[PDB]
Design a protein around this ligand. Structure first.
Ligand SMILES: O=C1NC(=O)[C@]2(CCCNC2)N1
Length: 435
């Protein structure tokens, strides 16, 4: 696999040992052949699990998730998918790695799609080798793959709201359950219902992932209520997965706004990864997987593929050449390579709105392409009245950096900035000029 001009997909079934058995062996061969290598982890939690599998090998951990003393003798670098894409965007010179390893290469976040595009382009050019590690490569139609031990698969109606009757099987369980919900607000309702019934619940989501995941190892729990973030390598000591088979889909309407569409069916890749959390112990057969819907190809027209094109159009590759998306996922968006290329100063603003502003890619691009500077927040209040952000069914208000109380009404409306309480509080802070 380590021969240049070669991209290998390592598609062993979930729990076959890609991370703990195959990855250390690849690292050893790369160090023997003096290949400057990058290892890309989807989350800080997977990076910490990788340090355990790679302990004793000279790897440089470019993450704050691991507390190791780097000697300077390392030719292998380990960083998160988002860190790699960020460093490509920023004016930091990233080495041109001879070997690129992506763990959980199925991740559909824009920074992961961009990383796959950049890497696969470098391989197509004959400049580098790559390895994509995932049980569910882009374009999988099988949601029931192999596992370490047999899983009991059951199609059943799954509640997506609080309940009093009709779902006795949910609370009649004596083990540990991982429940995938389409959104944070949906998770809150189900968690409140389980807690009222005397159950110990941990909730997980993108923003609180590292902190709450530690609670899954540190204390006894009955249920874990999570969003799709737990599809990226998160390991649990569970015996059942309850799967709504639903997700939210960010959609760009008329090229003017972003809505969160659905809940709608997940892809086969997500269903296989959610099911993949159980049946991982060969000595314990009979783990259950209860699913409450079918799969569909909801990644076509999904805003993340357009956002990944916005990122690759602003990453330098070679003169005016721009990286293409990784071929099996390239038709998920109708986009021309280069259409989102920004001039030097607008590009710098685009990077800063994402890095410091913490805004979604699409929204950061609308602001930067309009020729607005990072600290100028007048666009958060001058949008049409239909763009009024609402808090508790009344218009949201913020004190501007001028000491004037104004209704939050952005020129470009992106539902992700107000999808939950934490997202709205963070966007109010940005509109206030607090970061
Ligand atoms: O909202 C805006 N702030 C600004 O400085 C501009 C002025 C006119 C066009 N360039 C950007 N717009």
């Amino acid at each position: 696999m380590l021969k240049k001009k070669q991209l290998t997909v390592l598609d062993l079934h979930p729990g076959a040992g890609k991370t703990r058995r195959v990855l250390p062996e690849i690292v050893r061969e790369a160090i023997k052949k003096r290949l400057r290598t990058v290892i890309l982890a989807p989350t800080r939690v997977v990076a910490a699990e990788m340090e355990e599998a790679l302990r004793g090998l000279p790897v440089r951990y470019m993450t704050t998730a691991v507390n190791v003393t780097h000697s300077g003798t390392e030719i292998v670098d380990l960083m998160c998918h988002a860190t790699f894409t960020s460093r490509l965007l920023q004016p930091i010179r990233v080495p041109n790695y001879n070997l690129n390893i992506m763990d959980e290469a199925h991740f559909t976040d824009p920074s992961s799609i961009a990383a796959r595009g950049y890497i696969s382009t470098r391989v197509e050019m004959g400049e580098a080798a790559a390895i994509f590690m995932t049980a569910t490569p882009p374009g999988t139609r099988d949601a029931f793959p192999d596992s370490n031990s047999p899983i009991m698969d059951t199609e059943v109606e799954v509640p997506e709201r609080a309940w009093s009757s009709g779902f006795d099987w949910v609370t009649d369980h004596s083990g540990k359950t991982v429940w995938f919900v389409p959104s944070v607000r949906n998770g809150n309702e189900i968690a409140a219902c389980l807690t009222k019934a005397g159950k110990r619940v941990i909730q997980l989501s993108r923003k609180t992932f590292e902190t709450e995941f530690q609670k899954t190892k540190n204390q006894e729990w009955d249920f874990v209520i999570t969003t799709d973030i737990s599809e990226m390598g998160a390991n649990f000591k569970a015996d059942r997965v309850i799967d709504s088979r639903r997700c939210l889909k960010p959609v760009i309407l008329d090229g003017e706004r972003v809505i969160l569409a659905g809940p709608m069916p997940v892809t086969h890749a997500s269903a296989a990864q959610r099911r993949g959390r159980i049946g991982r112990n060969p000595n314990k057969p009979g783990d259950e997987y209860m699913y409450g819907g079918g799969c569909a190809e909801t990644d076509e027209g999904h805003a993340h593929w357009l956002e990944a094109r916005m990122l690759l159009d602003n990453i330098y590759l070679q003169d005016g050449l721009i990286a293409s998306l990784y071929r099996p996922e390239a038709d998920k968006v109708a986009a021309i390579e280069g259409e989102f290329k920004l001039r030097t100063e607008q590009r710098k603003t685009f990077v800063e709105l994402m890095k410091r502003g913490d805004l979604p890619v699409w929204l950061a691009y609308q602001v930067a392409s309009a020729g607005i500077t990072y600290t100028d927040r007048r666009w958060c209040f001058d949008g049409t009245t239909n763009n009024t952000i609402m808090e508790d069914s009344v218009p949201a208000e913020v004190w501007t950096k001028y000491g004037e109380k104004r209704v939050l009404k952005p020129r470009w409306m992106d539902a992700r900035v107000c999808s939950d309480h934490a997202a709205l509080k963070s966007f109010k802070e940005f509109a206030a000029g607090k970061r």
